[PDB]
Amino acid sequence: QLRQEAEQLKNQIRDARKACADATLSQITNNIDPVGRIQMRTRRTLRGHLAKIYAMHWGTDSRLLVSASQDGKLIIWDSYTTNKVHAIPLRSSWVMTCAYAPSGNYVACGGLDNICSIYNLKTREGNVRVSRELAGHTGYLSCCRFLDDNQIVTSSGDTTCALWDIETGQQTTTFTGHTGDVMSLSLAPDTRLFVSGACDASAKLWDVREGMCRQTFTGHESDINAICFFPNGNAFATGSDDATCRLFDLRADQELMTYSHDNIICGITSVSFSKSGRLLLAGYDDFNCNVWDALKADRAGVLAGHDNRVSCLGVTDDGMAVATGSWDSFLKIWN
Amino acid sequence: AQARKLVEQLKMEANIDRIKVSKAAADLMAYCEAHAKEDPLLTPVPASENPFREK
Amino acid sequence: TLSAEDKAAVERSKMIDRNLREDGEKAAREVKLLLLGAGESGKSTIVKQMKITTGIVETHFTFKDLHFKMFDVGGQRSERKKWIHCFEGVTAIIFCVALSDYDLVLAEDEEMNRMHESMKLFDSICNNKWFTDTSIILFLNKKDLFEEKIKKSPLTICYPEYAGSNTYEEAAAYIQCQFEDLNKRKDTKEIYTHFTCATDTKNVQFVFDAVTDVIIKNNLKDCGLF
Amino acid sequence: MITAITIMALYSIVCVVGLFGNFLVMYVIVRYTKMKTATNIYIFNLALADALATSTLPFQSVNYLMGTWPFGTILCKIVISIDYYNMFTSIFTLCTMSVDRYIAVCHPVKALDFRTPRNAKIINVCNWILSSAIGLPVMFMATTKYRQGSIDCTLTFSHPTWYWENLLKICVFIFAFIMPVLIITVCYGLMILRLKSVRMLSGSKEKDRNLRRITRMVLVVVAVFIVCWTPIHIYVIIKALVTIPETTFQTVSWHFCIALGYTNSCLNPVLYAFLDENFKRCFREF
Ligand SMILES: CN(C)C(=O)C(CCN1CCC(O)(c2ccc(Cl)cc2)CC1)(c1ccccc1)c1ccccc1
Ligand SMILES: CC(C)CCC[C@@H](C)[C@H]1CC[C@H]2[C@@H]3CC=C4C[C@@H](O)CC[C@]4(C)[C@H]3CC[C@]12C
Ligand SMILES: CC(C)CCC[C@@H](C)[C@H]1CC[C@H]2[C@@H]3CC=C4C[C@@H](O)CC[C@]4(C)[C@H]3CC[C@]12C
Ligand SMILES: Nc1nc2c(ncn2[C@@H]2O[C@H](COP(=O)(O)OP(O)(O)=S)[C@@H](O)[C@H]2O)c(=O)[nH]1
Numbered sequence: 001q002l003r004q005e006a007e008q009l010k011n012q013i014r015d016a017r018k019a020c021a022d023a024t025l026s027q028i029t030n031n032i033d034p035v036g037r038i039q040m041r042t043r044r045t046l047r048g049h050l051a052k053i054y055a056m057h058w059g060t061d062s063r064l065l066v067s068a069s070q071d072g073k074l075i076i077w078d079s080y081t082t083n084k085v086h087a088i089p090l091r092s093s094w095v096m097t098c099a100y101a102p103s104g105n106y107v108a109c110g111g112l113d114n115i116c117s118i119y120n121l122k123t124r125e126g127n128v129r130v131s132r133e134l135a136g137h138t139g140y141l142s143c144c145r146f147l148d149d150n151q152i153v154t155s156s157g158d159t160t161c162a163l164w165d166i167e168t169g170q171q172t173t174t175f176t177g178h179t180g181d182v183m184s185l186s187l188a189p190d191t192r193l194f195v196s197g198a199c200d201a202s203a204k205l206w207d208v209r210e211g212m213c214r215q216t217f218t219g220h221e222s223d224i225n226a227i228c229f230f231p232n233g234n235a236f237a238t239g240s241d242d243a244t245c246r247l248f249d250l251r252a253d254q255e256l257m258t259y260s261h262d263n264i265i266c267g268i269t270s271v272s273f274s275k276s277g278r279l280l281l282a283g284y285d286d287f288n289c290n291v292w293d294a295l296k297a298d299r300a301g302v303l304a305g306h307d308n309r310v311s312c313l314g315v316t317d318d319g320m321a322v323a324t325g326s327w328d329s330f331l332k333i334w335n
Numbered sequence: 336a337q338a339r340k341l342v343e344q345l346k347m348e349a350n351i352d353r354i355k356v357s358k359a360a361a362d363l364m365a366y367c368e369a370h371a372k373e374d375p376l377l378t379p380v381p382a383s384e385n386p387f388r389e390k
Numbered sequence: 391t392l393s394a395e396d397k398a399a400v401e402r403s404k405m406i407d408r409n410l411r412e413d414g415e416k417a418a419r420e421v422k423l424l425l426l427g428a429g430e431s432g433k434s435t436i437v438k439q440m441k442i443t444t445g446i447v448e449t450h451f452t453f454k455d456l457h458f459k460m461f462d463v464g465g466q467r468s469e470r471k472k473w474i475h476c477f478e479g480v481t482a483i484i485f486c487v488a489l490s491d492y493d494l495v496l497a498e499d500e501e502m503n504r505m506h507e508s509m510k511l512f513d514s515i516c517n518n519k520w521f522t523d524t525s526i527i528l529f530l531n532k533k534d535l536f537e538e539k540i541k542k543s544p545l546t547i548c549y550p551e552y553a554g555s556n557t558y559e560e561a562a563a564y565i566q567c568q569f570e571d572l573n574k575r576k577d578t579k580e581i582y583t584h585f586t587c588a589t590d591t592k593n594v595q596f597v598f599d600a601v602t603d604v605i606i607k608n609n610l611k612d613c614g615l616f
Numbered sequence: 617m618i619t620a621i622t623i624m625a626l627y628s629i630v631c632v633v634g635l636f637g638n639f640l641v642m643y644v645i646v647r648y649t650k651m652k653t654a655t656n657i658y659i660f661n662l663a664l665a666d667a668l669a670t671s672t673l674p675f676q677s678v679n680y681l682m683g684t685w686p687f688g689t690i691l692c693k694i695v696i697s698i699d700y701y702n703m704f705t706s707i708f709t710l711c712t713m714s715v716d717r718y719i720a721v722c723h724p725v726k727a728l729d730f731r732t733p734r735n736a737k738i739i740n741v742c743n744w745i746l747s748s749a750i751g752l753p754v755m756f757m758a759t760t761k762y763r764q765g766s767i768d769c770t771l772t773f774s775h776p777t778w779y780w781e782n783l784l785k786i787c788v789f790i791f792a793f794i795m796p797v798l799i800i801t802v803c804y805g806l807m808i809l810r811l812k813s814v815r816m817l818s819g820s821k822e823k824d825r826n827l828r829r830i831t832r833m834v835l836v837v838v839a840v841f842i843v844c845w846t847p848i849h850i851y852v853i854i855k856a857l858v859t860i861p862e863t864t865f866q867t868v869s870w871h872f873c874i875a876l877g878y879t880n881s882c883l884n885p886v887l888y889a890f891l892d893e894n895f896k897r898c899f900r901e902f
Contacts, residue, residue: 002338006345013349023357029364035377043387048407050414052478070476071417073410080386083399084406089413094446094476112466112473114444138444139468157445157468177344181468199469216348232366234359252359253351276374278367295367319375320386335375335387419728456725577823580816602724607816609720609727614655614892615830616816 017254025247025256029295035278038291038301040322040334044082048075049329054111055312056325057100062318066107067331068098074109074119079321079333088119088128094140097154101146106131106166108152110141116154118166134164136171142183147191147208155182155196163208173211177204184226188233195248197224197238203248217248219255226270226313230294231277237294239268245282245292259292261299270313270324281322283310289324303334421601424477425462427486428504428511432531433464436486436586439593453594456601460484475520481604483526484597485515486586489565490535492548505548513572516581525604526581527597528569530562533587619864620681623871627677630875634670634882638663641885648898654736658713659888661740665706666881672699673878680871685767689760692769696758701751704792706881708743710841711796713888718803721810750787785856793849797842804834833891840887844880848873 051071058065064085065077072095074088092113099108107128110116116134123129139157146152147163155161161175161182180200187194193214195205201224203217217238226239234250237259245259245268259282270283273294280294281303289310291301308327315322322334371377375385382388427433437460440451447462461480466473491504516526537558545552545561549568554560562585570581580603584596610616641663651657675695679685685692716736720727759772773780808831811817817827851873860866889895 002342006338006342009342009345009349013345016349016353020353021356023355023360025356025360025363028357028360032364032368038376040376043389048410050410054476071414073413075406075410078399078403081396081399082403084403085399087406087409092443092446093448094473096473096476112446112476114446114465140445140466140473142472157466157472159468181472183472199472213344213348214351230363230366231370232363235363249356249359251354252356253353254356256356256360256363274374274376276367276370276377277363278371278374279376295364315376319373322376333387335379335385415732454725456728577820603815605724605728606721606810606814609724609731612653612655612731613717613720614894615717615833616826616893 020252021254025295026297032295034296034298035293035300038279040301040303042305042332043335044079044333046077046079046082046323046331046333047329048084049073049331051329052308052327053311053325053329053331054096055098056314056323056331057098058314058316058321058323059100059104060102060317061104062316062320064100064104065314065316065323065331066098066100067312067325068095068109068111069329070094074098074107076107076121077331079316079323086121086128090117092117097141097143099144099146099152101149103149105149106146108144108146110144110154112140114138114140114156116141116144116152116164118152132166132169134166134169136162139181142181143185143196145185145187145194147187147194151208153185153187153194153208155185157181159198161185161194161196161206163211173208175204175206175211175213177213178202180223184224184239186227186229186236188229189231190233193233193250195227195229195236197227199223201240203227203236203238205250215250215253217246217253217255219246219248220244222267225268226283228271228273228280230273231275237271237273237280239271239282241267243267245271245280247294257294257297259297269309269311272313272315274315275317275319279315281313281315281324283313283324283326285309289313305332306330419457421456421458421482421605422477422480423458423460423482423484423597423601424480425460425484425486426511426515427464427529428508429464431486431488431508432529432586433462433486435531436484436529436593437462439589439591442594453598456598458597458601470514474518478520480521480524482597482600483515483521483524484529485512485526486529486531487512487569488532488535489530489562490532490539492536492545492565493539493543503548509569509572512569516573516579517575522575523579525579525600526573527600528566528581528583529586529593530566530569530583531586533558533562533585536561619868623868624677624681626871626875627673630878630882631670631673631677634673634878635667637882637885638667638670641889642667644889644895644898648901649894652733653894654716654731654733655713655892655894657733657736658709658716658740659892661744662706662709662713662884662888665702665709666884668698669702669706670878670881676874679768683766685769692760693755693758696769696771697751697755700754701747703877703881704750705744705747706884707792707796708747709740710884711799712739712743714800714803718807721807781856785852789849789853793845797845800838800841804838808834833887837887840883841880844876844883848876 049069051069053067053069056065056067063080067075067077072090072093074090075084076086078085090109092111094112095109096111105122107119107121114137117130118132119128120131121128137156137158141154141156143155144152150166152164152166159178162171163173165172178198180198182196182198185194185196192208193205195203197203201218201220205214220240222241224238224240227236229236235247237245237247239245243260243264246255247257249256266285268282268284273280278294280292282290282292284290287306289303290299293300306326310324310326312325323331325331425433442451445465449460451458487508494504496502496504540556540561545556552564566583573581582600584593586593645656645660651660672695719730757771759770761768761770811827817823
């Protein structure tokens, strides 16, 4: 009945996408100069975690980051001089995500405890005290990104993303539509759109204001473990488990690039873009981080030096750092 | 009962304007080459202004 | 050459380091017990005898100067795969199986055959790439329920290839024997079984013995012997 | 003539294998693996004591290769001090490794919070301190004597040399032989009983084979210590009691009994590092 209508409309969408595709990204970028053999060295080796790190988030001031690991400690890291500004004892020992606000006055954490904790950083007493305890998900939290100082957008294991009003603790918008466990979301540079990836290998972009889903991208096979917008806000890249990173387009709505290698069979758990956007760094699962030229789909460098899985990755807002975490309680910053 | 709302969601996703891949990829390449001087990763800045240096 | 701000930063990071070190030293003695089991297995009954959020339920109890932490995952129902590697170093598993559902038929599937479903769950937990060296304890909870279930009903509903007896002892021994060979790696992994239903501290004593045996194995691994 | 050649040859071969073992152990335990665990700290301390103890072998080889010892007096004092210090500390760390293993197996709850790196560090620096507590009288009583037209390193006592010599010989016979043997046998026997009685080493052919080879290597360690430490103490006790006539056989047997302790000190790295599986994994990666 209606399922045949849905299938024929999917076929029409695919036909329109194929008719709208006339040149791949790699064919027109054959005449640009590559970045050569790029090499980066570990300038700082941040240490002090005693468990497996799962997430890290940078700051807009390009100096302070945060890191969340399995021991229930949230360490605020000063990258310049390898210092620890704050330590937050989390009630939940299980965290898969951590957020750092653009204002820098709020740090968030969440995970398998089904609660998005929000911590106040700039209190008058100096100590870090929890401000608002968000609730309303029936699954494990997996990503949280600060839209602004009063709005936070989270993804969870109940197959729905959610936009939150922090001062009320309510979900103003629920982003239903995922036929699978959504794990990673990233916000646009103009903070009005965001796109996420789920276990059903779908990349669904949403609207913050009204909640409608605009586009879907189902080019991947296994799942989507990571996602990160391009600096211009008109593209993004997605991690997976089938040893592939794929670039997706907001305006053309296709798959552009395939960042895959023959010998690579492991998964990707973190992706982030540089300030220019030509450099896409992916935290793989074969105990190293990789450099992917985002305009050529070739490997230009390797950020090795990790003895375990590179769970989280983040490029700072001014291009002056590449801070990657790992499962062996280490964060390291590359230049 | 989700088949109906899946149909409305899919038909709302279908009728959107899509530009050609050549123009969009050219725009992506133009944004990459227009910020190449602001990226210390691609072009390594000298140590006189690098904020991560040994003690 | 550094002024008060760098001295304050150095002392702040030193204090954070002492707090982190003492908290990691305090939590290094903790024993992690991933409790498991499907619905109506007896997990709520066996967390009632240890008197001494939407997803993960945390309970803490100490016994003979050793600390146990219990990670019930019954709230989470999305994907065991996407958070089962988040434990990765639990001391022992407290997997439970109901023995009364040898003859039970599911009201929502009509052919699922619940005891075989528990067999698939136990096989997936045992033969996991993340859990290949940890000990897995079986708590076959319901004893009296399948006692007066097999007092009248046969035992060939679950295993038509089994006919040795119809009484409690041989049936229980047979099902434990065919349940412990689900372990495809018994060379360096051990599975225990207690059969539960004591209304006493016998389950606590069983997990105490299993945890101390795992700690003995860990100390042998640390001593460069085993 | 030939006997001095063989004594010099055995001292030289024992010294070179001792330095090679207790330097390859050092190189591995610094570069390949680190001192994270308590066992690595103990093995490193044992390597220190054994490497510094066997370094005094060329001093004795030039004491008896061809005659006199023109090295000096303060050099004699420091050589006697480092020998009686480092062998004593090697024995003490050999004992505390056994106590650590008995703690690890028989008392697991206490072994969770007792086998920290800090506790191992403070215990073995306390062992070096307790060795130094008897090493200072060794430095005080060391001297250089010139008799029979030759230079030799005696150990002068007070005016009653018999009483002080008796107390020193009893203290080095009891606190370095009969106390290590007793504690090592009690601790390792209780450990072997608990290892036989555990579930992970019983119920299968391979697990019983692992238990048997663990007991075999424990027996090898204790048997090597006994066979390389009993004859020297019996030799010195009976040369203190009765007047053994000087002959070639006495010289050869005396130098064998001296060299047996250094044979123990040079067999300790191959019995405590190559036997452990962590160093086996460290060698397997290269
Ligand atoms: C004989 N017994 C009972 C020991 O206990 C002894 C000490 C013997 N010591 C060795 C060095 C010496 O030969 C020497 C003379 C002159 C110079 Cl310039 C330099 C060195 C003088 C005699 C020992 C036994 C077996 C092997 C090695 C030593 C020992 C063991 C453990 C701790 C303390 C003492
Ligand atoms: C105090 C006087 C009498 C003697 C001093 C000698 C002793 C105490 C010294 C000499 C060599 C030292 C060791 C040298 C190096 C290390 C490695 C380090 O990772 C832990 C400490 C440790 C293992 C030291 C412990 C103390 C030590 C054994
Ligand atoms: C552990 C094994 C080797 C058994 C121990 C054997 C001990 C007790 C043996 C081995 C070498 C022996 C010595 C060898 C030679 C002599 C010279 C002789 O004129 C008197 C006996 C005397 C001094 C022996 C005493 C006993 C002795 C020290
Ligand atoms: N008579 C009898 N009853 C038993 C026995 N074992 C368990 N129960 C009951 O089983 C329910 C727990 O199952 P529950 O739904 O909480 O599981 P869960 O996975 O959601 S935590 C409890 O009400 C128990 O009285 C038994 O031997 N005899």
